[PDB]
Enzyme design. Structure first.
Site, PDB file in Angstrom:
ATOM      1  CG  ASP D  32      49.618  62.205  50.874  1.00  0.00           C
ATOM      2  OD1 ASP D  32      48.733  61.525  50.328  1.00  0.00           O
ATOM      3  OD2 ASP D  32      50.237  61.722  51.870  1.00  0.00           O
ATOM      4  CG  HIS D  64      47.179  58.485  51.788  1.00  0.00           C
ATOM      5  ND1 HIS D  64      48.368  59.091  51.477  1.00  0.00           N
ATOM      6  CD2 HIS D  64      47.473  57.430  52.589  1.00  0.00           C
ATOM      7  CE1 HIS D  64      49.361  58.454  52.111  1.00  0.00           C
ATOM      8  NE2 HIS D  64      48.845  57.435  52.751  1.00  0.00           N
ATOM      9  CG  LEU D  75      43.137  73.472  63.275  1.00  0.00           C
ATOM     10  CD1 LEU D  75      41.885  74.297  62.923  1.00  0.00           C
ATOM     11  CD2 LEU D  75      44.369  74.367  63.315  1.00  0.00           C
ATOM     12  CG  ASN D  77      39.693  72.630  67.395  1.00  0.00           C
ATOM     13  OD1 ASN D  77      39.808  71.419  67.759  1.00  0.00           O
ATOM     14  ND2 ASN D  77      39.396  72.949  66.141  1.00  0.00           N
ATOM     15  CB  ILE D  79      35.700  69.822  67.303  1.00  0.00           C
ATOM     16  CG1 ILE D  79      36.636  70.811  66.548  1.00  0.00           C
ATOM     17  CG2 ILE D  79      34.393  70.490  67.792  1.00  0.00           C
ATOM     18  CD1 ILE D  79      36.294  70.968  65.046  1.00  0.00           C
ATOM     19  CG  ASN D 155      52.851  50.072  54.183  1.00  0.00           C
ATOM     20  OD1 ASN D 155      53.327  50.424  55.254  1.00  0.00           O
ATOM     21  ND2 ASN D 155      51.927  50.737  53.528  1.00  0.00           N
ATOM     22  N   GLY D 169      62.389  56.729  50.634  1.00  0.00           N
ATOM     23  CA  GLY D 169      62.809  56.402  51.997  1.00  0.00           C
ATOM     24  C   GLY D 169      64.207  55.835  52.098  1.00  0.00           C
ATOM     25  CE1 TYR D 171      67.989  57.279  45.794  1.00  0.00           C
ATOM     26  CE2 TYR D 171      65.843  58.355  45.896  1.00  0.00           C
ATOM     27  CZ  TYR D 171      66.770  57.611  45.202  1.00  0.00           C
ATOM     28  OH  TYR D 171      66.465  57.282  43.898  1.00  0.00           O
ATOM     29  CB  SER D 221      50.876  56.176  55.006  1.00  0.00           C
ATOM     30  OG  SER D 221      51.135  56.373  53.654  1.00  0.00           O
TER      31      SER D 221
HETATM   32 CA   LIG Z   1      41.028  69.357  67.112  1.00  0.00          CA
HETATM   33 CA   LIG Z   2      67.123  56.723  54.828  1.00  0.00          CA
END
Ligand SMILES: [Ca+2]
Ligand SMILES: [Ca+2]
Ligand SMILES: [Ca+2]
Ligand SMILES: [Ca+2]
Lengths: 275, 107, 107, 275
Positions: D32, D64, D75, D77, D79, D155, D169, D171, D221
């Protein structure tokens, strides 16, 4: 070969020409973009320019004034077209520049030249939507001095039921002229209002262009010179009728058309005017 | 930052196209007044005045035009203060078109 | 003499305005390629190619964009070879918009 | 306080987390725009950049890749948000520039890094409408090497009855992912075609943004990382299932939705996949 524009016929000029009335010895000032004095079908007597940056009244860089001039007085010969008053003496009073634009004070000065050189008839195929006291004063002075003043009414078509006549056409001392087609139908563009006086041919009017050319234009501009040329024929028949008398004649012997907000008194008929 | 970009065209006729565009200029008032305007600085100034409002651009008062009927179509497209604009107006003849702005149609 | 003058705008959204124009440039291909285009010369060239035909401006082939959906409206207004133009197209996101011309939208 | 994005719930990740399956020891490469390693709710293990002019994989100038990364592994946690596989080891393979654009060869090189560093899962939330032999070769090689490859479908919404799935995508070796909303309705923008495999939440998906921020994005995405995170949970439960086995699981235990041209096999359900 000489051809006769339909509009010259419509107003009955040729009837007068055959009786020997051609506008002879009448002084007409075409207040405009100048007149190309070198055109074969025109005879320009004199004139002057009020455009500071274009000082030669006989060089028409716009072409408008030349066209207008030919509707008034293109010569009676065997070439081109034929004017309403082919023997009138034509004066180029240049007050519009190459782009056709002119300042109010140029116009006014043009009118003042015209009064002081004893013009008999003034034609102003020009306009603007605002009036001015000096402009008014100038037109009124001309009429006080004995000049027949003719102007086109404007090309702003109709607008609700408000007057679309511009200046100087709007001033009572001025004959304001609208445009009809060969069918006596008001052109769509012709201004309307209680200030309109008479109608004349204003749709695809053949006339002289600079460079020994000929062509057709549209506008209340093309209508006006038909009335100015018409005033010159009457003066040529009756040289000591006053301007009040010429005007009256023109206005009382019209061919009534539609309602007077659109058509004023109607189509002029110079043969009827001249009695 | 003024998103400011306009395109002005002029052609003979009474509608957008049935009226071939004979002349076309671009005007940018932001940041600084630039473009293809024999009068950039001024047009911007005119717009500044009326604040991008075509329709509020007083004629002449002081100028006469010939009373020929030869219509001209003016189109204006773009954005002024990031507000889209698409104006179109037919004038009687070109002299009438020029007596309108001061400078905008100073073309 | 090419009557050539365009105005390009871009804003986030799916229609002309419900899409505030965030950026706007002007492009002139005639006489010479000028305007407010971080890529005047080229865009002109792109247009020259396809001959002013928005709708015939091949994407990338060689570039990937993120698969975020954040639509962008592009508008084009003016004249090309004295032919009026008013194009408008929504792209998925801006990267998609930029993979389109080469240079036109090189903005 | 930590909040759980609706999409993480929809696919039933929390059921697995409670059984102790969080993606632990699974290597996921997010191919990315980079990942901001400085975000408090992310733990980035390593990575590399293939963007010649932006050589730091942990500086995301587009934002992105950071969002995508958080959907995979924000994570567990007290927060921010919570990822699908909160214990996965996250690798930033940067192949898109600040403007989000990336050359095909950058992408390919990213994939080749991923194969050679023994990534278990690849996520490619990127696409283009043209395919290429080298691109195909790269994706196929990854799958031959044992990597689960996931990509968003595209999209480009619907277009007659032609496929709007982009590359990679498109393939067969790739799991191609479309976007649903919280109501299991296909988003209007989600690409359609016979190449679409599964659906995941892709509409206003809350996730990490660079600069200790959080925000919601739309797109296929946002859908993709839900399947990639889903592959990581399964591997964490069954560490010597092959990529063929993980894929199969994901594809056979979906919640069937509409017709497969629009919805592929339907909504993934990781709890069902993990058996
Ligand atoms: Ca978190
Ligand atoms: Ca496919
Ligand atoms: Ca003659
Ligand atoms: Ca009057």
């Amino acid at each position: 070969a000489q051809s006769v524009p339909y509009g010259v016929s419509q107003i009955k000029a040729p009837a007068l020409h055959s009786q020997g009335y051609t506008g002879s010895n009448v002084k007409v000032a075409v207040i405009d973009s100048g007149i190309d004095s070198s055109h074969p079908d025109l005879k320009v007597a004199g004139g002057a320019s009020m455009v500071p940056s274009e000082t030669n009244p006989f060089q028409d860089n716009n072409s408008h004034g030349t066209h207008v001039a030919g509707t008034v007085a293109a010569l009676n010969n065997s070439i081109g077209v034929l004017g309403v008053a082919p023997s009138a003496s034509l004066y180029a009073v240049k007050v519009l520049g190459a782009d056709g634009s002119g300042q109010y004070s140029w116009i006014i000065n043009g009118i003042e030249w015209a009064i002081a050189n004893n013009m008999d008839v003034i034609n102003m195929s020009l306009g603007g939507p605002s009036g001015s006291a000096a402009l008014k004063a100038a037109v009124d002075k001309a009429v006080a001095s004995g000049v027949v003043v003719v102007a086109a009414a404007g090309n702003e078509g109709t607008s609700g039921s408000s007057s679309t006549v511009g200046y100087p056409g709007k001033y009572p001392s001025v004959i304001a002229v609208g445009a009809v087609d060969s069918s006596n139908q008001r052109a769509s563009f012709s201004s309307v209002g209680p200030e309109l006086d008479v109608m004349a041919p204003g749709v695809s009017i053949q006339s002289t262009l600079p460079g020994n050319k000929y062509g057709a234009y549209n506008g209340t501009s093309m209508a006006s010179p038909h009335v100015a040329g018409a005033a010159a024929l009457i003066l040529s028949k009756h040289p000591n009728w006053t301007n009040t008398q010429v005007r009256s004649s023109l206005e009382n012997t019209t061919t009534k058309l539609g309602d007077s907000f659109y058509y004023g008194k109607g189509l002029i008929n110079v043969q009827a005017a001249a009695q | 930052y003024a998103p400011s970009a306009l395109v002005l065209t002029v052609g003979k006729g009474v509608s957008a196209t049935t009226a071939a565009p004979e002349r076309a200029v671009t005007l940018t008032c932001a940041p600084g007044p630039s473009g293809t305007h024999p009068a950039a600085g001024s047009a911007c100034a005119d717009l500044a005045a009326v604040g991008g409002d075509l329709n509020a651009l007083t004629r002449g008062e002081d100028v006469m035009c010939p009373m020929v009927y030869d219509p001209v179509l003016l189109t204006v497209d773009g954005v002024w203060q990031g507000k889209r604009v698409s104006y179109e107006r037919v004038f009687s003849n070109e002299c009438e078109m020029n007596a309108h702005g001061s400078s905008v149609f100073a073309f």
